[PDB]
């Protein structure tokens, strides 16, 4: 009946201060946001638009698996022509309660 609560990975009580290391999967983001991508070329003489659910940098291409980076397949682009890309971020209507995103709290114990 209740969502999965936050999870403490590590703690440190250092000079009267608490430093908490939370396991952060960012599910609240992953489930609400998505990208809408617009591609224009000359073949393709009309604006092609697609949606992105996963922006994960896994592979197994000769690229990278690092952080501070996002990966996604862009259909409609041809290497021989000039193409213009334009991205937008859109929210998921299912995440809203009384027109408010991420509307609620969560319950945890530090002991």
């Amino acid at each position, epitope marked *: 009946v209740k*969502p*999965d609560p936050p999870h403490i990975k590590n703690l440190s009580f250092h000079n009267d201060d608490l430093y908490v290391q939370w396991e952060n*999967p960012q*599910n*609240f983001i*992953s*489930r*609400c*946001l*998505f990208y*809408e991508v617009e591609v224009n070329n000359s073949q393709t003489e009309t604006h092609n*638009v*697609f*949606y992105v*659910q*996963e922006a*994960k940098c896994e592979n197994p291409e000769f690229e990278r698996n690092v952080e501070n980076t996002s990966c996604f397949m862009v259909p409609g682009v041809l290497p021989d022509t000039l193409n213009t890309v334009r991205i937008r971020v*859109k929210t*998921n*209507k*299912l*995440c809203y309660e009384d027109d408010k995103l991420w509307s609620n709290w969560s319950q945890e114990m530090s002991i």
Partner: antibody
Amino acid sequence: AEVQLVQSGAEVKKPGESLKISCKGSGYSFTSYWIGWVRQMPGKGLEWMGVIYPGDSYTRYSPSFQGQVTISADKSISTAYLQWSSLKASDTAMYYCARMPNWGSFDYWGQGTLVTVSS
Amino acid sequence: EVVLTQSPGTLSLSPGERATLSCRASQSISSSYLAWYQQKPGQAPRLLIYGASSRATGIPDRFSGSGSGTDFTLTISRLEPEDFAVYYCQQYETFGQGTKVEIKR
């Protein structure tokens, strides 16, 4: 592998009995997408039941379906569930589970589970 | 909530003809949230178009979605015998009542 959602077998239950249908997804990141439940009564159209985001089990229900049924998930076995505590004859329908990206469309469907409730 | 009305309820056409199904939304909706589905007798529905105009994987070129705000259209250019089924438009918790596309004889 290709995306596939596989649902549990046909059920013939008496009114007043509990029931839990399962939906097992494969060929994709189970927790990356939501799972929806759609009802299709004999000879009728489609009805959006409710949805779950397996990642954090964030569940939403259509007003017609709230408090009538329970949507749950088991990350570990790539499974989504729909359940009634006390079935009525009026629950007789085909039930489909489907995969849904954040835009709300259902891109892959389960084969359906036929539910028959009678005295 | 949002209510989608499909027109007509039954479309009677010959194979090879042009099919235009319409989906009217009660309120103006974002084109990214509208999708069309096909459902053959005794089969699970299949998604054809999402985001009002984007074809799903493997959906042939004959199916094209267009529309904006309140008036959305599904177009089957040339009708192949497989194309005679029930088509539904949807935005989140809201589904259309369906359009059966049948063989006119």
